[PDB]
Ligand binder design. Sequence first.
Ligand code: HEM
Ligand code: HEM
Ligand SMILES: Nc1cccc(CCc2cccc(OCc3ccc4ccc(N)nc4c3)c2)n1
Ligand SMILES: Nc1cccc(CCc2cccc(OCc3ccc4ccc(N)nc4c3)c2)n1
Ligand SMILES: [Cl-]
Ligand SMILES: [Cl-]
Lengths: 362, 362
Amino acid sequence: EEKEILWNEAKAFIAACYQELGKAAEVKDRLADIKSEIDLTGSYVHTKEELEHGAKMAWRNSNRCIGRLFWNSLNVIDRRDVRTKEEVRDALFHHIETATNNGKIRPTITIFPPEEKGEKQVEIWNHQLIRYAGYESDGERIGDPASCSLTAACEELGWRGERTDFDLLPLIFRMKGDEQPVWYELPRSLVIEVPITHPDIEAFSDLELKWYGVPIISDMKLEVGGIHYNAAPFNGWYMGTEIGARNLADEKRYDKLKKVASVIGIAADYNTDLWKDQALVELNKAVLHSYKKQGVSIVDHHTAASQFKRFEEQAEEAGRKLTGDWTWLIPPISPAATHIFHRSYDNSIVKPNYFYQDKPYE
Amino acid sequence: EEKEILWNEAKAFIAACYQELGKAAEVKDRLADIKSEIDLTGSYVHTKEELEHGAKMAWRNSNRCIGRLFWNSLNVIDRRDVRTKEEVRDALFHHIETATNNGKIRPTITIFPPEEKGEKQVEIWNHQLIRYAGYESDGERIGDPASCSLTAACEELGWRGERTDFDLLPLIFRMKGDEQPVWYELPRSLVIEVPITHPDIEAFSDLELKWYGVPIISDMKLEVGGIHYNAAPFNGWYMGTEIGARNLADEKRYDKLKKVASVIGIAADYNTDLWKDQALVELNKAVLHSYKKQGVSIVDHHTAASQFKRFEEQAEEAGRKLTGDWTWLIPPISPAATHIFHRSYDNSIVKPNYFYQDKPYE
Ligand code: HEM
Ligand code: HEM
Ligand SMILES: Nc1cccc(CCc2cccc(OCc3ccc4ccc(N)nc4c3)c2)n1
Ligand SMILES: Nc1cccc(CCc2cccc(OCc3ccc4ccc(N)nc4c3)c2)n1
Ligand SMILES: [Cl-]
Ligand SMILES: [Cl-]
C-alpha cells in the first residue's frame, strides 16, 4: 500500500513543480513514466531539475523560517550516488567548505540517497554538522548542554572530548547494514569560528566567547513528492539573535548574561533595572559586530524582518498563499519592533517541506 | 429562546461558583429560584457574592493576562442600582479615585446594570476611562493616533481639545433611551500622571514624555452565568512594557524611538547597531524608574512573569486547568528571558470571562 500514497504525492508535486518551471506540457508523459516506475520498482527517482526545485520549494514552505526571501537561490548539491562512508564523509566535508565559502556563506543543501522502503540508507546523528560538545557530571557543567546526549553517545564509540567549553563534535553517521555509526574528527581548517568582541567595550573579550560560522542543520527530513530524504543537511547564515539571545544567553545553554552584565559594568541585582534586557542588547550587538568584523555572513533581526516583508509581497504578487508560524517568526529581541509581530500568519503545512525525525540515540 | 441559553449558562456558573465557595449544598435551591425567575422575568439577578466571585473568575480565565496571580483580590464595586447620567458619571469618578488610591493602585472593577434583552442600559464609549486624545489633519500628527476616531466623535458632540500631545479625553457614555451620549471633563485632581525621566541620563527629560497612572479598560463585556455586563470598567496596574514598548514606542502610537536614541547619545543609522533595541531598553528603564519614583504602582515584565509562574503552580495545586494565549502572554521586550516563552498554553475559552464588543462609533 506504500505506493498508493507515493503516487498521490508525486502527482501533486510534479504538476506544481513543472507548472512553476514552465514545463506544464511535459507533465503528462513524466507522470506515466512515474506510474510505470512505481509499479515496477516500488518508488521513483527525481530528475536533477525536480530535486533542485523541490528542495527550493521546501524552503519556501518552511513556516518557521524568516529567511525565505532567498529560497530560489539555494545551491543544491546532488549526492544520491553515495554508497560508502568515505564518500558520505567527504561530501559532508565538501558541504562545510563550499557553504562556508571563506565567510561569504552560500545557502547550500547536500542531498543523500532517500529512504528506500522507509529503511534509511545514511543516518546522520549530528544535529548540526558543526556544533560544540557538552558534558555534565559531578555537578560540573562544561560546554553546550544541548549537546549532552549526543556527546555521551559519541564517547561510547571511542571518541573523547578535551572538555573545553567549545569542543567540536565529530561527524557521526551510520550506513545501512552497519550497526554502529562511524565518527570522524572535523578538520579544523574547514571550520571558521568567530571570537565575540564588542565594538565599544574592550573588556568584553575577557568573557572568551566564540561561536562557529555556519549553522548546518543535519537532522531534518526533506520530503519532495513522496520521497523521504532523511539525510539532507542544509545551511543558511545565522540571524544574530540565534547566537546572542539563545545559544549564548539561555539558562539551559551557555547562560552568559550575568557575566555579560559584569563586563559591561551594570549591576545584576534588580529586575526593575532591566539588566537582563540591557545585557541581551550588548551581547547581540557584539555578535553582529564580530561576525561582520571577521567577514562572516550574518543578518540582524531588523534586516531579516524587512527581507521577510519582501517575501510576503513576492508571494502575493505571484498568487501563492503565504504560510507562517508567528511564534517562530518573531525574533526573541524587540519583536514588536518588526512588522511580523503586528500581523498574523496561516500555519498550514504545505509540501515539499522539511520535517523533524526521531533521533537514533538517547 | 433567549432563556434556554441563559438557563444553561446559569447552571454551569452557579454549580462551579458555589463549589469554589464551599456552598455546594445551597446549589439546589438557588437554581430553582433561578428557573422560576427566568420563566417569570426573562432573566435573573446575581447575588452580591455571585457577582463578586464571577468577576474574579472572569479575570482568572483571561487567557491573555499575565497578571492573574492576584485574581482573588479584585475589589468589586456593585453599581447595578445606577439609573441616571449623574450616577454613572459619579461612579466612574469614584472608580478612578478608589482604584488610584494615591498611587497604591487597587485592582478594581465597577459593575453597572447588565444588558436586559441584549438592549444596553449604559454604553461607555471610552476605551479606557483615562486616555489621551489624538488628531490627524493636513498632515499634522498630534497626540495618540489610537484615539483619533473617538476624539473625532467627541468633537462632534461639542467637546474641543487643546491639541497638546496629552489632552485627556472626557468621559463619554450613552444612557438607554437617550440618543446621543453625554460627555464630562475629567477633574484633573483625580488623574495621576507620571513624567518620564531616566535614572542616569538627565537629558531624557528633554523629551517631555508622560503617561497616566492607571489603565482602566472600559469597553469590554463581562459575562457571568449568561448575564452580559457590557459596562464593567476594570483596572490593574501597568506592566512597564505596555508604556515603554508599545504606547510610547509603536510607529502607530507616539513613535518616540528616534528621539530616545538621540537623547541617549547613540546613532540611529544602521540596523546592525541595534539602536532600536537599545532605545527600547532605556525607554523601558525610564518608565519603571519614573513610576516607582513617583509612588505609582507598576511591575516589570520579569517580576510579572515570575508571578505568572506562581499562578500556573497555584492552578495545578488547585486541580484547575490553566488556559493562556502565548502570543499575548510573552512580553514584547526580551520575551525568551521569561519562562512563558519556553512553554505552551491551551488557548481554550472558559467562562466567566471578559470579551470584546463592537464600538458604538466610527
Ligand atoms: C539564508 C539565511 C537564513 C536565515 C537567516 C534563516 C533564519 C531562520 C531562523 C532564525 C530560524 C529559527 C527561528 C526561531 O528560532 O524562532 C529558522 C528556522 C528554519 N529555517 Fe531558516 N534561515 C535561513 C536559511 C534557511 C535555509 C537555507 C533553509 C533550508 C533550505 C531553512 C529552513 C528553515 C527551517 C526548516 C526552519 C525551522 C526548523 C525547525 O522547525 O526546527 N532556512 N530560519
Ligand atoms: C493587577 C495588575 C495587572 C497586570 C500587570 C496585567 C497585565 C496585562 C497585560 C500586560 C495585558 C496585555 C498583554 C499584551 O499586550 O500582550 C493584559 C491583558 C488583559 N488583562 Fe490583565 N493585568 C492586570 C490586571 C487585570 C485585571 C484587574 C483584569 C480584570 C479584572 C485583567 C484582565 C485582562 C484582560 C481581559 C486582558 C486582555 C484584553 C484583550 O483581549 O484585549 N487584568 N493584562
Ligand atoms: N520557545 C520557543 C519559542 C519559539 C521558537 C522556538 C524555537 C527555538 C529553536 C530551537 C532549536 C532550533 C531552532 O532553529 C532550528 C533552525 C533550523 C534551520 C535554520 C536555518 C538557518 C538558520 N539561521 N537557523 C536555523 C535554525 C530554534 N522556541
Ligand atoms: N501584535 C500583538 C501581538 C500580541 C499581542 C498584542 C496586543 C497588544 C494590545 C493592544 C491593545 C490593548 C492591549 O491590552 C489591552 C489590556 C486589557 C486589560 C489590561 C489590564 C491590565 C493591564 N496592565 N493591561 C491591560 C491591557 C494589548 N498585539
Ligand atoms: Cl544554532
Ligand atoms: Cl494602555
